[PDB]
Amino acid sequence: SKQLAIKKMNEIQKNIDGWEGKDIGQCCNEFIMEGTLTRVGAKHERHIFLFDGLMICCKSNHGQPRLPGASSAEYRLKEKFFMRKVQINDKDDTSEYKHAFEIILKDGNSVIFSAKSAEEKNNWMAALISLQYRS
């Protein structure tokens, strides 16, 4: 039960709130990108929180229920990863859409995401190569 790393996200989403200005971590928080990002050209993106090195995401699990206190609630964080040894690249799609970014893991997967906007797209992509420059 060594979730000491997965336990930080909790104290990171409540001990510092959720924004892109204040920061509680030294080099693994400060929510470098608190907004919304998707996974490539998906139709259901999810909330995201970039910790200038970490990559967390949140979203309703069983959709929104009629009301809490009736059958059971399951709302909570979604998934989390380590965005520090990864690199975000770009593609040659059309300004119309599909202009997301494709990051890759060094194990055998690819962290491709897509913001529902123009600045939001190039936003998370820059928050990644931004930490690589140094952190």
Cβ pair 131, 84 in contact under 8 A: yes
Was domain 1-135 assigned CATH 2.30.29.30?
Answer: yes
Q: Strand pairing partners for 34? A: 49
